[PDB]
Amino acid sequence: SRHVVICGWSESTLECLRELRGSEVFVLAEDENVRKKVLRSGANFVHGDPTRVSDLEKANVRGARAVIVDLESDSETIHCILGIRKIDESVRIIAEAERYENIEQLRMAGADQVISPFVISGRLMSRSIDDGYEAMFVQDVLAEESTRRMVEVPIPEGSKLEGVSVLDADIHDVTGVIIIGVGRGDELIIDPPRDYSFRAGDIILGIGKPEEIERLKNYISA
Amino acid sequence: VPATRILLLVLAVIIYGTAGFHFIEGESWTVSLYWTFVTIATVGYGDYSPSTPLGMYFTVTLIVLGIGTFAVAVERLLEFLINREQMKLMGLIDVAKSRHVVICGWSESTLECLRELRGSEVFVLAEDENVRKKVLRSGANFVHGDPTRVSDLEKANVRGARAVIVDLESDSETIHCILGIRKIDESVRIIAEAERYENIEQLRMAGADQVISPFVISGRLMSRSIDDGYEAMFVQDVLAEESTRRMVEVPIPEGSKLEGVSVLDADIHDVTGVIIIGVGRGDELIIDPPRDYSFRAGDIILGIGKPEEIERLKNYISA
Amino acid sequence: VIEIIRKHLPRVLKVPATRILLLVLAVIIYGTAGFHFIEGESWTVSLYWTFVTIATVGYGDYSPSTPLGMYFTVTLIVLGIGTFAVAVERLLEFLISRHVVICGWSESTLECLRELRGSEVFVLAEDENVRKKVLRSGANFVHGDPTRVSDLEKANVRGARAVIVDLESDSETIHCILGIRKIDESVRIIAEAERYENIEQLRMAGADQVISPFVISGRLMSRSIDDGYEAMFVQDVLAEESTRRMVEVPIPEGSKLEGVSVLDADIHDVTGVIIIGVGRGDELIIDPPRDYSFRAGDIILGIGKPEEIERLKNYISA
Amino acid sequence: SRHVVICGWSESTLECLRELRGSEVFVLAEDENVRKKVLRSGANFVHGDPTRVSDLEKANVRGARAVIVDLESDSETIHCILGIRKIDESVRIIAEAERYENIEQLRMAGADQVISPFVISGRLMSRSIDDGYEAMFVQDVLAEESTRRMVEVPIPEGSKLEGVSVLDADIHDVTGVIIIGVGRGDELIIDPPRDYSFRAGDIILGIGKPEEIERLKNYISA
């Protein structure tokens, strides 16, 4: 589609570029050690300060489709999010919280999705004291080299599953795809109850083999 | 002054006290020693007292001597007790926790690990003495030392721990701290944190049992939240112990009802209501198991469901 | 006498009260149980006696009856009173419109605190050296990081009249405004910008009045090159010692001026104040035009003598 | 023959370049301010991170005959040997341990020779309190401008002294070379016993005058 701007360069924006192959990426950071790393990863480099609005418009924020803000501190991530919200008041901002207490304050600043890597890994370290199957499931469904991939399929308008409840469908027994959650808008219902009924526009978060996912895309088609 | 001067003066008085009450009053040593204490203690219970001019004389003299030396000995004792506690607060030795947990390094990853590990004994081994205040505010004991030293890893009692959590500044010291633990105890559980994707196979070959990479997890949730952020909304909500559904794992006991049956004939989701996202046997995990998967004893079923549904599952898999 | 020792040695008040409490409790347990099982006392008595014994009073209503009782009690007392004295010393140590909050300490907040000498002021700054300067100005000091919600609630932000944020940079000033809006979205926030470019980010974060001092100062050092009357007017109408002052006068309901235009009212001729502006809610019309009719609720910004100010209040009244 | 890779710049690796004049030497360091100091000694600078496996293949570790690792800590020296041993499993690694407890951990990671300078300095410090003749011996035979040189002369296949013991050979009287050891593979027998017989291709570590070294190589020739 369109291009993706990345504000700041860290170890998590370096691992994000490995899946943005086939798109166009503008990285906005400092020159001293970063320009050689960015051009070796298939992205443009725009030298500037991402907290400054005159340098955000060099990186083409106004026409982008997603902005990814991973700065050094959580006070400079907020100061860069409010600089994006002056140029374009509608673009998607995926921020990243270095501390847990600033998660509610990066949503007030304007971010649409706040990733928090140290609360996730701090909660997978304490659930691996006994046995670490919680940590082996998160780090497997996100890699695109595995067998089962967590995908999301949208329910079309005027479909064969619109209005049909989850008891009447039994999507795992027919398609082989585990329906671990149904998202409607900006809210996600993990493990929906048996009295839930689908609509037109619901997105089905699911885990299955690519043989099984394409069988699900034909099961909800009309 | 030597501590021995203080002690000898104390001892001299109790001897004086005990002996004079015997010589003046004719009282036995049991009561003579006791009375001397009673007067030093300034309690006066009313059983023993001097009953002669010399006993009264002796007693008054004795009290003065007794309290003086006593009070000094006591303040030294109290100072020693405080000093011992202060050293413990700084951190020195580790009290043989059978299952205690050792945390090598203080960062933002191991701080949210200490919010879920409340109640258990947790020792935090870190080099900077500035973070001593943050560790004891979270209810964890602090051990001041360098975690890449085998002479300082033994000060935190790594040999008796149930798990060691390693999160140091770089990946160079996380491998070096793992290599130090594997010669102290080659059977303890090491959970370590990888900052680069290059070193995940390096931390695992050095001896880590579970390697967790937060920049590869977050780097994959940021490239997947561009279109729709339902993948990061799911991951960050099943780990929180404040949501509705909770991801727990139940083991299959010996002689159960499900020992041998396939997954399709079991109907774990239909009866219990728990979504079975995967099953794990030993040290591997199979996500979305096929329908021909036969359950064996010792398996571990990893699932998501409400806490009303998990109890319904446990009675269904029981023996 | 141990209490004398404690006064001599406050130097060892270094450990948690929780350690102190656990240890004293262990002692009273020893005492009480022995009186119950060795002396044969009831539990009411055993505890009573134990307290009396530990405290070193020893009335003698109860006393040890056997050598074992004597051995037991000697231990009980010798250890208990020391601990008791410690516990007592720690307890003594512990025992002995609205306000405005100021987050940060700089030269802008030191001159702001001169005019707020009547009200109650809490100053929240993380540096420990600035504690002495707040108490000289008649304001309470709260020690903590002002960008933290756990330390903003210690400074009583939720019931404040207004909060004044003046921190070291504009990244921390924004991170502090969003921490106040996390507590309440109704209190007034007055913020200060160091750079001209960050004025719109401080308004989006939640500040109600952004005061940029170096933009006013830079725009007064370019007008003072020819004649310095612009920098002489601004630095005179704000001084409270001055002869003329820039004050605000609200128009009450059903007034004699409502619906009257500014050339139909003739305020400067009758009263004697100079109408430099009139504010309607959160805006301000400086030099209002001919067809501006007044209303009940507008605030009149004027400059005049204090003997001309009361004449304006006695004229526009209902 | 081939080149030599030197990871890390310090005072130990500066003194190694003074005796490596006339060979190709690549220096892989993370500081940019040392580019003038490296190039002044006849060494081609390669800017990179030595503990990263991508920047190790920049400096041609594969076609090297020796890799000298000396970094700022024993953690990064262990991590650099673990990265060279992935690339080249048969290259020769010379490493520099700081602590005494890390000598076996640098050796289990894959280093062929571990030189600990802080232990040799601590041994010669406590042996110079009475008479400092032991410290003067070590710092004179290693100098390139001294009267006597400590050398290594190997036994060729088919030599005159195959099977001869060290007693009946009498190396010191014929040649003048003080025989302080015989190396057989990766072990060294300091002060070899009189019943120790020689063998083909066995090195003789010894001290002597340069006119006495040339008289030894004819005494052991065929």
PDB file of C-alpha atoms in Angstrom, chain C residues 65-211:
ATOM      1  CA  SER C  65       6.807 -19.328  92.133  1.00  0.00           C
ATOM      2  CA  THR C  66       9.499 -21.870  91.273  1.00  0.00           C
ATOM      3  CA  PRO C  67      13.217 -21.757  90.299  1.00  0.00           C
ATOM      4  CA  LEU C  68      12.020 -22.457  86.796  1.00  0.00           C
ATOM      5  CA  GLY C  69       9.750 -19.462  87.033  1.00  0.00           C
ATOM      6  CA  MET C  70      12.696 -17.403  88.232  1.00  0.00           C
ATOM      7  CA  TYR C  71      14.989 -18.624  85.437  1.00  0.00           C
ATOM      8  CA  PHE C  72      12.241 -18.055  82.890  1.00  0.00           C
ATOM      9  CA  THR C  73      11.376 -14.629  84.059  1.00  0.00           C
ATOM     10  CA  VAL C  74      14.996 -13.500  84.182  1.00  0.00           C
ATOM     11  CA  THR C  75      15.316 -14.316  80.502  1.00  0.00           C
ATOM     12  CA  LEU C  76      11.985 -12.739  79.710  1.00  0.00           C
ATOM     13  CA  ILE C  77      12.853  -9.492  81.324  1.00  0.00           C
ATOM     14  CA  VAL C  78      16.404  -9.132  80.202  1.00  0.00           C
ATOM     15  CA  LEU C  79      15.515  -9.511  76.587  1.00  0.00           C
ATOM     16  CA  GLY C  80      12.089  -7.947  76.611  1.00  0.00           C
ATOM     17  CA  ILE C  81      12.920  -4.628  78.086  1.00  0.00           C
ATOM     18  CA  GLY C  82      15.660  -3.936  75.591  1.00  0.00           C
ATOM     19  CA  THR C  83      13.300  -4.652  72.760  1.00  0.00           C
ATOM     20  CA  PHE C  84      10.537  -2.706  74.442  1.00  0.00           C
ATOM     21  CA  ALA C  85      12.732   0.369  74.681  1.00  0.00           C
ATOM     22  CA  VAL C  86      13.515   0.085  71.010  1.00  0.00           C
ATOM     23  CA  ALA C  87       9.899  -0.230  70.048  1.00  0.00           C
ATOM     24  CA  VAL C  88       9.024   2.777  72.146  1.00  0.00           C
ATOM     25  CA  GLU C  89      11.696   4.903  70.573  1.00  0.00           C
ATOM     26  CA  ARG C  90      10.520   4.065  67.064  1.00  0.00           C
ATOM     27  CA  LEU C  91       6.977   4.940  67.950  1.00  0.00           C
ATOM     28  CA  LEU C  92       8.007   8.292  69.393  1.00  0.00           C
ATOM     29  CA  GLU C  93      10.009   8.955  66.256  1.00  0.00           C
ATOM     30  CA  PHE C  94       6.878   8.362  64.189  1.00  0.00           C
ATOM     31  CA  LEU C  95       4.478  10.217  66.432  1.00  0.00           C
ATOM     32  CA  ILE C  96       6.411  13.412  66.681  1.00  0.00           C
ATOM     33  CA  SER C  97     -10.405  28.679  47.840  1.00  0.00           C
ATOM     34  CA  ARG C  98      -8.340  25.487  47.669  1.00  0.00           C
ATOM     35  CA  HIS C  99      -4.572  25.011  47.386  1.00  0.00           C
ATOM     36  CA  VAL C 100      -2.356  25.377  44.317  1.00  0.00           C
ATOM     37  CA  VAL C 101       0.305  22.873  43.257  1.00  0.00           C
ATOM     38  CA  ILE C 102       3.622  23.850  41.660  1.00  0.00           C
ATOM     39  CA  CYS C 103       5.443  21.051  39.830  1.00  0.00           C
ATOM     40  CA  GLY C 104       9.092  22.015  39.533  1.00  0.00           C
ATOM     41  CA  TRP C 105      11.249  24.790  40.937  1.00  0.00           C
ATOM     42  CA  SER C 106      12.854  27.496  38.814  1.00  0.00           C
ATOM     43  CA  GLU C 107      13.031  31.277  38.660  1.00  0.00           C
ATOM     44  CA  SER C 108       9.532  31.514  37.175  1.00  0.00           C
ATOM     45  CA  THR C 109       7.988  29.686  40.136  1.00  0.00           C
ATOM     46  CA  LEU C 110      10.014  31.602  42.733  1.00  0.00           C
ATOM     47  CA  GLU C 111       8.534  34.888  41.496  1.00  0.00           C
ATOM     48  CA  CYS C 112       5.090  33.292  41.189  1.00  0.00           C
ATOM     49  CA  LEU C 113       5.254  32.241  44.843  1.00  0.00           C
ATOM     50  CA  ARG C 114       5.739  35.868  45.926  1.00  0.00           C
ATOM     51  CA  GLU C 115       2.188  36.766  44.903  1.00  0.00           C
ATOM     52  CA  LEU C 116       0.682  33.538  46.283  1.00  0.00           C
ATOM     53  CA  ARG C 117       1.766  34.236  49.868  1.00  0.00           C
ATOM     54  CA  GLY C 118      -1.805  34.123  51.156  1.00  0.00           C
ATOM     55  CA  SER C 119      -2.868  30.757  49.754  1.00  0.00           C
ATOM     56  CA  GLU C 120      -1.654  27.249  50.514  1.00  0.00           C
ATOM     57  CA  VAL C 121       1.064  26.155  48.071  1.00  0.00           C
ATOM     58  CA  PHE C 122       2.546  22.680  47.625  1.00  0.00           C
ATOM     59  CA  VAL C 123       5.798  22.503  45.651  1.00  0.00           C
ATOM     60  CA  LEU C 124       6.669  19.147  44.082  1.00  0.00           C
ATOM     61  CA  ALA C 125      10.267  18.785  42.906  1.00  0.00           C
ATOM     62  CA  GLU C 126      12.627  15.822  42.926  1.00  0.00           C
ATOM     63  CA  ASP C 127      15.771  17.701  43.954  1.00  0.00           C
ATOM     64  CA  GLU C 128      16.527  17.764  47.678  1.00  0.00           C
ATOM     65  CA  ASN C 129      18.507  21.027  47.759  1.00  0.00           C
ATOM     66  CA  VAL C 130      15.447  23.162  46.957  1.00  0.00           C
ATOM     67  CA  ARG C 131      13.700  22.198  50.208  1.00  0.00           C
ATOM     68  CA  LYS C 132      15.162  25.158  52.107  1.00  0.00           C
ATOM     69  CA  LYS C 133      13.983  27.777  49.595  1.00  0.00           C
ATOM     70  CA  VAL C 134      10.326  26.707  49.606  1.00  0.00           C
ATOM     71  CA  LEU C 135      10.004  27.070  53.388  1.00  0.00           C
ATOM     72  CA  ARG C 136      11.448  30.591  53.245  1.00  0.00           C
ATOM     73  CA  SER C 137       8.616  31.535  50.868  1.00  0.00           C
ATOM     74  CA  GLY C 138       5.846  30.076  53.042  1.00  0.00           C
ATOM     75  CA  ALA C 139       4.962  26.944  51.085  1.00  0.00           C
ATOM     76  CA  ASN C 140       4.958  23.227  51.812  1.00  0.00           C
ATOM     77  CA  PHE C 141       7.510  20.982  50.113  1.00  0.00           C
ATOM     78  CA  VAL C 142       6.636  17.576  48.642  1.00  0.00           C
ATOM     79  CA  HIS C 143       9.610  15.480  47.556  1.00  0.00           C
ATOM     80  CA  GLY C 144       9.100  13.333  44.483  1.00  0.00           C
ATOM     81  CA  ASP C 145       9.299  13.064  40.734  1.00  0.00           C
ATOM     82  CA  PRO C 146       6.634  15.391  39.262  1.00  0.00           C
ATOM     83  CA  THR C 147       6.155  13.263  36.124  1.00  0.00           C
ATOM     84  CA  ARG C 148       4.981  10.315  38.266  1.00  0.00           C
ATOM     85  CA  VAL C 149       1.306   9.819  39.101  1.00  0.00           C
ATOM     86  CA  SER C 150       2.301   8.091  42.352  1.00  0.00           C
ATOM     87  CA  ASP C 151       4.063  11.305  43.439  1.00  0.00           C
ATOM     88  CA  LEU C 152       1.547  13.709  41.905  1.00  0.00           C
ATOM     89  CA  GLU C 153      -1.151  12.264  44.163  1.00  0.00           C
ATOM     90  CA  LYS C 154       1.107  12.851  47.169  1.00  0.00           C
ATOM     91  CA  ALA C 155       1.052  16.584  46.322  1.00  0.00           C
ATOM     92  CA  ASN C 156      -2.764  16.780  46.447  1.00  0.00           C
ATOM     93  CA  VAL C 157      -3.387  17.462  42.761  1.00  0.00           C
ATOM     94  CA  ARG C 158      -6.963  16.103  42.728  1.00  0.00           C
ATOM     95  CA  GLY C 159      -8.411  18.808  44.961  1.00  0.00           C
ATOM     96  CA  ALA C 160      -6.285  21.675  43.679  1.00  0.00           C
ATOM     97  CA  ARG C 161      -7.416  25.083  42.493  1.00  0.00           C
ATOM     98  CA  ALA C 162      -4.775  25.152  39.749  1.00  0.00           C
ATOM     99  CA  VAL C 163      -1.546  23.316  38.941  1.00  0.00           C
ATOM    100  CA  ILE C 164       1.509  25.167  37.612  1.00  0.00           C
ATOM    101  CA  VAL C 165       3.971  23.056  35.606  1.00  0.00           C
ATOM    102  CA  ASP C 166       7.456  24.484  35.002  1.00  0.00           C
ATOM    103  CA  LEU C 167       9.988  21.705  34.445  1.00  0.00           C
ATOM    104  CA  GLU C 168      13.437  21.502  32.874  1.00  0.00           C
ATOM    105  CA  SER C 169      12.399  20.778  29.281  1.00  0.00           C
ATOM    106  CA  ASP C 170       9.261  20.559  27.174  1.00  0.00           C
ATOM    107  CA  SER C 171       9.416  16.768  27.029  1.00  0.00           C
ATOM    108  CA  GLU C 172       8.984  16.562  30.810  1.00  0.00           C
ATOM    109  CA  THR C 173       6.427  19.380  30.899  1.00  0.00           C
ATOM    110  CA  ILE C 174       4.241  17.434  28.462  1.00  0.00           C
ATOM    111  CA  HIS C 175       4.777  14.176  30.367  1.00  0.00           C
ATOM    112  CA  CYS C 176       3.634  15.989  33.540  1.00  0.00           C
ATOM    113  CA  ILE C 177       0.511  17.549  31.993  1.00  0.00           C
ATOM    114  CA  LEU C 178      -0.703  14.131  30.811  1.00  0.00           C
ATOM    115  CA  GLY C 179      -0.146  12.769  34.325  1.00  0.00           C
ATOM    116  CA  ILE C 180      -2.416  15.419  35.812  1.00  0.00           C
ATOM    117  CA  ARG C 181      -5.144  14.745  33.238  1.00  0.00           C
ATOM    118  CA  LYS C 182      -4.886  11.085  34.274  1.00  0.00           C
ATOM    119  CA  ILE C 183      -5.955  12.123  37.783  1.00  0.00           C
ATOM    120  CA  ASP C 184      -8.599  14.737  36.930  1.00  0.00           C
ATOM    121  CA  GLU C 185      -9.625  16.291  33.616  1.00  0.00           C
ATOM    122  CA  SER C 186     -11.143  19.403  35.214  1.00  0.00           C
ATOM    123  CA  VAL C 187      -8.370  21.159  37.167  1.00  0.00           C
ATOM    124  CA  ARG C 188      -6.691  24.195  35.611  1.00  0.00           C
ATOM    125  CA  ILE C 189      -3.163  23.589  34.305  1.00  0.00           C
ATOM    126  CA  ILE C 190      -0.879  26.571  33.677  1.00  0.00           C
ATOM    127  CA  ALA C 191       2.206  25.533  31.740  1.00  0.00           C
ATOM    128  CA  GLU C 192       5.385  27.222  30.553  1.00  0.00           C
ATOM    129  CA  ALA C 193       7.145  26.554  27.251  1.00  0.00           C
ATOM    130  CA  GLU C 194      10.882  26.911  26.678  1.00  0.00           C
ATOM    131  CA  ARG C 195      10.607  26.842  22.867  1.00  0.00           C
ATOM    132  CA  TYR C 196       8.162  28.565  20.539  1.00  0.00           C
ATOM    133  CA  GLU C 197       7.576  25.404  18.500  1.00  0.00           C
ATOM    134  CA  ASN C 198       6.150  23.402  21.422  1.00  0.00           C
ATOM    135  CA  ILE C 199       3.249  25.733  22.217  1.00  0.00           C
ATOM    136  CA  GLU C 200       0.681  23.687  20.303  1.00  0.00           C
ATOM    137  CA  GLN C 201       1.867  20.397  21.814  1.00  0.00           C
ATOM    138  CA  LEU C 202       1.390  21.783  25.326  1.00  0.00           C
ATOM    139  CA  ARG C 203      -2.156  22.820  24.410  1.00  0.00           C
ATOM    140  CA  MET C 204      -2.958  19.388  22.969  1.00  0.00           C
ATOM    141  CA  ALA C 205      -1.587  17.688  26.086  1.00  0.00           C
ATOM    142  CA  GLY C 206      -4.057  19.562  28.272  1.00  0.00           C
ATOM    143  CA  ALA C 207      -2.714  22.919  29.446  1.00  0.00           C
ATOM    144  CA  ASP C 208      -5.254  25.716  29.743  1.00  0.00           C
ATOM    145  CA  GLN C 209      -2.782  28.629  29.713  1.00  0.00           C
ATOM    146  CA  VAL C 210       0.650  28.339  28.079  1.00  0.00           C
ATOM    147  CA  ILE C 211       3.016  31.165  29.036  1.00  0.00           C
TER     148      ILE C 211
END
